[PDB]
Design a protein around this motif. Sequence first.
Motif, PDB file in Angstrom:
ATOM      1  N   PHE A 151       1.015  -1.040  -0.331  1.00  0.00           N
ATOM      2  CA  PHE A 151       0.198  -0.098  -0.016  1.00  0.00           C
ATOM      3  C   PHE A 151       0.875   1.406  -0.036  1.00  0.00           C
ATOM      4  CE2 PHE A 151      -3.397  -2.866   1.976  1.00  0.00           C
ATOM      5  CZ  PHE A 151      -3.920  -3.149   0.906  1.00  0.00           C
ATOM      6  N   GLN A 197       2.704   1.947  -3.156  1.00  0.00           N
ATOM      7  CA  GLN A 197       1.297   2.220  -4.730  1.00  0.00           C
ATOM      8  C   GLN A 197       0.526   3.733  -4.418  1.00  0.00           C
ATOM      9  OE1 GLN A 197       0.672  -0.156  -7.127  1.00  0.00           O
ATOM     10  NE2 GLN A 197      -0.343  -1.886  -5.313  1.00  0.00           N
ATOM     11  N   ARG A 198       0.507   4.092  -3.202  1.00  0.00           N
ATOM     12  CA  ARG A 198       0.191   5.358  -2.902  1.00  0.00           C
ATOM     13  C   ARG A 198       0.810   6.731  -3.447  1.00  0.00           C
ATOM     14  NH1 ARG A 198      -5.205   6.491  -1.418  1.00  0.00           N
ATOM     15  NH2 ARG A 198      -4.546   8.861  -0.637  1.00  0.00           N
ATOM     16  N   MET A 233       0.999   6.433  -7.122  1.00  0.00           N
ATOM     17  CA  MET A 233      -0.062   7.651  -7.892  1.00  0.00           C
ATOM     18  C   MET A 233       0.471   9.042  -7.389  1.00  0.00           C
ATOM     19  SD  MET A 233      -3.332   5.826  -6.071  1.00  0.00           S
ATOM     20  CE  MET A 233      -3.761   4.624  -6.552  1.00  0.00           C
ATOM     21  N   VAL A 246       1.198  11.803 -10.719  1.00  0.00           N
ATOM     22  CA  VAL A 246       0.274  13.608 -11.424  1.00  0.00           C
ATOM     23  C   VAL A 246       1.286  13.979 -11.084  1.00  0.00           C
ATOM     24  CG1 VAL A 246      -0.483  14.117  -9.396  1.00  0.00           C
ATOM     25  CG2 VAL A 246      -1.901  12.482  -9.827  1.00  0.00           C
ATOM     26  N   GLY A 287      -5.719  10.095  -3.418  1.00  0.00           N
ATOM     27  CA  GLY A 287      -6.262  11.066  -3.252  1.00  0.00           C
ATOM     28  C   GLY A 287      -7.590  11.101  -4.142  1.00  0.00           C
ATOM     29  N   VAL A 305      -6.166  10.805  -8.296  1.00  0.00           N
ATOM     30  CA  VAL A 305      -5.923   9.603  -8.988  1.00  0.00           C
ATOM     31  C   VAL A 305      -7.175   7.948  -8.654  1.00  0.00           C
ATOM     32  CG1 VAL A 305      -4.739   7.190  -9.578  1.00  0.00           C
ATOM     33  CG2 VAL A 305      -4.348   9.427  -9.378  1.00  0.00           C
ATOM     34  N   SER A 306      -7.139   8.410  -6.877  1.00  0.00           N
ATOM     35  CA  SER A 306      -7.593   6.854  -6.507  1.00  0.00           C
ATOM     36  C   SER A 306      -9.155   7.265  -6.591  1.00  0.00           C
ATOM     37  CB  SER A 306      -7.800   6.675  -5.360  1.00  0.00           C
ATOM     38  OG  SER A 306      -6.700   6.509  -4.890  1.00  0.00           O
ATOM     39  N   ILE A 312      -9.645   6.697 -10.167  1.00  0.00           N
ATOM     40  CA  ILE A 312      -9.855   5.859 -10.108  1.00  0.00           C
ATOM     41  C   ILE A 312     -11.410   4.722 -10.185  1.00  0.00           C
ATOM     42  CG2 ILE A 312      -8.873   3.066  -9.730  1.00  0.00           C
ATOM     43  CD1 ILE A 312      -6.351   4.732 -10.046  1.00  0.00           C
ATOM     44  N   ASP A 350     -11.385   8.673  -1.697  1.00  0.00           N
ATOM     45  CA  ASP A 350     -10.075   8.525  -2.217  1.00  0.00           C
ATOM     46  C   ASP A 350      -9.257   7.801  -1.213  1.00  0.00           C
ATOM     47  OD1 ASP A 350     -10.256   8.744   0.334  1.00  0.00           O
ATOM     48  OD2 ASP A 350      -9.097  10.608   0.941  1.00  0.00           O
ATOM     49  N   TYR A 351      -9.009   6.517  -1.086  1.00  0.00           N
ATOM     50  CA  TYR A 351      -8.873   5.192  -0.749  1.00  0.00           C
ATOM     51  C   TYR A 351      -8.823   3.966  -1.448  1.00  0.00           C
ATOM     52  CZ  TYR A 351      -5.956   7.788   3.163  1.00  0.00           C
ATOM     53  OH  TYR A 351      -4.852   8.266   3.276  1.00  0.00           O
ATOM     54  N   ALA A 389      -9.556   2.345  -5.195  1.00  0.00           N
ATOM     55  CA  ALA A 389      -8.537   2.327  -6.141  1.00  0.00           C
ATOM     56  C   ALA A 389      -7.577   1.274  -5.653  1.00  0.00           C
ATOM     57  CB  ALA A 389      -8.114   3.705  -6.192  1.00  0.00           C
ATOM     58  N   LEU A 390      -7.261   1.217  -3.768  1.00  0.00           N
ATOM     59  CA  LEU A 390      -6.344   0.358  -3.623  1.00  0.00           C
ATOM     60  C   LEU A 390      -6.693  -1.037  -2.722  1.00  0.00           C
ATOM     61  CD1 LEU A 390      -3.365   2.386  -3.023  1.00  0.00           C
ATOM     62  CD2 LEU A 390      -3.571   0.465  -4.864  1.00  0.00           C
TER      63      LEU A 390
END
Lengths: 534, 534
Positions: free
Chosen positions: A5, A8-9, A12, A16, B14, B16-17, B20, B44-45, B48-49
């Motif tokens: 996790f 991965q965050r 992201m 961006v 957040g 990007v999430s 997604i 926001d979590y 996406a994941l």
Amino acid sequence: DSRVFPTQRDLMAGIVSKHIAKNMVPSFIMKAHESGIIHVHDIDYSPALPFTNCCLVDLKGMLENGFKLGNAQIETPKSIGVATAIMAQITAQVASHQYGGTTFANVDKVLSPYVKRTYAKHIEDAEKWQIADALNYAQSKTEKDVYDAFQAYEYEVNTLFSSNTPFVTITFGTGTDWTERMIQKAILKNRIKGLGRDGITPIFPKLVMFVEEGVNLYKDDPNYDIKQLALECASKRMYPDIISAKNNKAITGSSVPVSPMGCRSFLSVWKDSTGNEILDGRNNLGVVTLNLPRIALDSYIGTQFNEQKFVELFNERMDLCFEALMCRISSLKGVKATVAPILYQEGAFGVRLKPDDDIIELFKNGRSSVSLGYIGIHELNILVGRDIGREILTKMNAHLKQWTERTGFAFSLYSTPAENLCYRFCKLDTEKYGSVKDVTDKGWYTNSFHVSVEENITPFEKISREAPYHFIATGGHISYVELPDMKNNLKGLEAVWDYAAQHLDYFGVNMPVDKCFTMNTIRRTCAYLGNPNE
Amino acid sequence: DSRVFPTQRDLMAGIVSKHIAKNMVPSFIMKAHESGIIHVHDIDYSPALPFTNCCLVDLKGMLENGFKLGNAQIETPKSIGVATAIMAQITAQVASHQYGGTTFANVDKVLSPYVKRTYAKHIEDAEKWQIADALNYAQSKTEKDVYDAFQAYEYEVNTLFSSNTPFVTITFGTGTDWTERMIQKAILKNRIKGLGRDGITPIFPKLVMFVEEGVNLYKDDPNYDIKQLALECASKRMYPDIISAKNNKAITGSSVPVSPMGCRSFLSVWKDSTGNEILDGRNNLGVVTLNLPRIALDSYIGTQFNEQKFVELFNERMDLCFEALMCRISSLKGVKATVAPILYQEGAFGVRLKPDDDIIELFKNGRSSVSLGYIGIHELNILVGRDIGREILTKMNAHLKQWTERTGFAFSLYSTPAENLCYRFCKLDTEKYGSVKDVTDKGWYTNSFHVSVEENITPFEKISREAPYHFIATGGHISYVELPDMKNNLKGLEAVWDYAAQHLDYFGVNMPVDKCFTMNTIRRTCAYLGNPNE
Ligand SMILES: Nc1ccn([C@H]2C[C@H](O)[C@@H](COP(=O)(O)OP(=O)(O)OP(=O)(O)O)O2)c(=O)n1
Ligand SMILES: Nc1ccn([C@H]2C[C@H](O)[C@@H](COP(=O)(O)OP(=O)(O)OP(=O)(O)O)O2)c(=O)n1
Ligand SMILES: Nc1ccn([C@H]2C[C@H](O)[C@@H](COP(=O)(O)OP(=O)(O)OP(=O)(O)O)O2)c(=O)n1
Ligand SMILES: Nc1ccn([C@H]2C[C@H](O)[C@@H](COP(=O)(O)OP(=O)(O)OP(=O)(O)O)O2)c(=O)n1
Ligand SMILES: [Mg+2]
Ligand SMILES: [Mg+2]
């Protein structure tokens, strides 16, 4: 680890940020970057956000005055255990507000005062409980409290490294006092023990030891016993690396040994408005690396090297790098100290800015360093047919001098660690020129001025060949020697150190570091320790 | 704080999430979410994941067996200071692998064994140094080591809270042993002192104390002295909140008091394959909150409420919520334990999965709870013209029972903290219906089943009115009472607790908590403590 996790965050935010950089960095800089002509480092952090790179944290100034961590007004610690705990807390703060390494310089000197408060308390406890051996008690317990303190620091760092990234460096070696000597042994002994049940080899904090005649270089200096522990440590856990206090001061022009920020970034001597030499609290603003083999490749006409073409590509690429470094420094204009309170308001950068102060003013006039990286002198020498390493670098410095005079920022020549860049430059040069014997064929470029591996050279020879580059690439440099198991041959290892200390600045030794858990396999193939099995 | 680097990076992940999620969540769910019909939390979590939400960490199982933190094989701590340091390290790990709160239940019981090892060492040190008062020495020093341990935990938490987010909860109160009693006082006394020079009020860790007859409820139970310290603490720092062990066990069906995961999420009793009641290591899979005033608003025809319309909107929105919760639970299929080693492989969720095991199998058959939130019963009562709180909730439970039977997941009714949702639902309902007297006019909806503020009600009255909801919304609930300075009136405060303990499950008291730094101003306006000045 990528499936995790936190990673991965971060990717992201990185995606961006690379996208945002695409809309902020002038097009010609991004294309040179995409094509491998240069490499703008940390594009996944900056300039999307006004992050800086690496630093020497002014821990001393933070522990003595107080400092705010969140809303809590921290006070001078009253024990060694609480000061390293605070150090670990500052480490977590600093790591999340810059994208490069964080260094705590001379922890033996800086933390020394708390080993004394810890001692005093054990003396006040020797009487209060009517203890016979008062002095040998305060001695025993204090020893244990310093040991416990650094053991706890190491696990703190280990957790950060797994809940996020964090490169942290701890330097020591110049302290002689008994408190300073105790910290050093405490750091060295925890390292030798290793981490966890199987006492494995930690990858951080990196340990770097200053060695100096009169302190711990010769069989008769006060701290020769530490150098001996240090040697045992290096044979078992790779670190510490060492810095020749002697050469280091001549290169940096500094009265005291200059600890690297992160892996190998070196500041140059600087004075505040009042004539004082400041080291701690200073930082670096970023790295843009120049692909040197590629300037040479792009200078071939058919299969022949064209010297006049090279001169033009070199000059134009130098201006390009300058433009790239300035682009990001300009991204910092108008940024407020509200962006990172620990760094700008609470003392980690050694000053105290107000929320509404611009952070860029702090970096001006030589206070922060700025890096022009390079890589592959070995491959460049081959493509040009003679050895021009010392020469091309010396020329880069003359350009750097003018940049510094034109802008006031202290640009310096930096030997890029290039843990991945070594592959990335080679692979992009290959998409254009394919397999080139001795250059792109192997798949990577040799780091900075190092003598390529694949070269049956003795340690002293390798050291003698690389040493001059330490006086040239003043912004960052290191030399490595490969050695077999030196665990039962500490005099051998010491022989190499001694030679290194005499001839160059920053040095470390790569040896195999393994354990049959009946496994823990570590190697320093490029810049950091790693399990070569991955 | 938004200008800060850690926060900015997080908003990028957040954004990007949320993007997604837009491509993964069925369209009808996203629109109901955009319009305020329901609220999919933490979009926001997740999805996406494949993050989960809140949990009770199985610290006991981690400290006794060992566990791997990174590559380091941690062993049972040998001292109280090292066990809370490890607890803090686990806290950092867990916080970065779930998006909801993390709770350490019964730290008095769990950490108790390390207070004894610490004691033993001070006894072995009483002889080795020929100490007269051997027993009073081991007593003094141990006391100080437990105190130091919890002081260090608090600052660890404070740093995490500023280098990232992290809601952590520490529960205790059921332990009677001397070790357990020492931990409790150590936690309570550090809290009373506060953080830093100005001893300010920390916002985390939340402290919750179990109160029980025979333990610490009545003037003559073994721990009445703690309840007294606890009261002083609450009057000075708001926490701890308390849980009536008595009611808590009847609601959860559990043999031992159930600590909330995060702020107020309650598990229900569950057994492993061998008949054992497991609490620690269990978690929650997410929250989807139903906008209740809005079901009623959308049931008006002109300015009149239509009952038959309501029944249809309620039924259809219930299926919608079910669909929303299942959508995310389905996002977890095929996810491997490689995603979060601390949680799935090393014991925080109380089992030991292999890298290649699917994490979803662990949550099945009632092991993890799943939340159907709701808010605004006060405003709903107004829009329907009578009080239907207990009734609508009871009906939601019957739906929840079928969901649980159809899927095997333990769905429960949850009283959403809604620190922001209280504004967001109101503002979106307002874009459609405008200012509605007593409902959207004030700008926010009342939390869950709470009696609206703006209601001159006495504490016992408020408690008596809210208490039944604790036996209904079994997945999460709390009751607050507003009180003036009770610092010089601890009997007053105790009177309220006593009444609360007798009638409901989870309770806390809101009072003003300030200091003229000649300032530190805290209030619990919604769910957490905060400086109302912001
Ligand atoms: N992990 C910790 C523990 C303490 N502190 C802070 C709180 C105080 O502002 C400053 C003082 O620390 P202490 O040395 O006083 O720690 P103790 O209170 O445990 O020891 P003592 O009671 O002997 O003062 O350090 C901190 O930042 N981090
Ligand atoms: N070919 C590359 C270059 C970089 N990166 C990633 C890894 C790092 O987290 C981040 C940092 O990138 P740099 O652009 O700074 O490249 P390096 O990590 O090789 O250089 P150095 O070790 O000198 O920092 O980008 C990557 O995946 N592949
Ligand atoms: N901050 C710390 C300090 C230690 N440990 C780990 C290393 C060991 O696997 C386990 C054992 O801890 P100790 O209690 O042994 O810590 P010490 O070595 O300092 O005390 P002692 O020498 O009395 O064992 O805890 C840890 O995870 N985090
Ligand atoms: N109107 C809203 C709702 C949410 N959020 C942000 C704040 C949180 O970091 C994240 C979590 O959002 P939720 O969707 O879970 O909303 P809440 O924080 O109000 O609910 P709760 O306190 O029950 O977690 O989203 C926001 O800015 N504005
Ligand atoms: Mg103190
Ligand atoms: Mg130990």
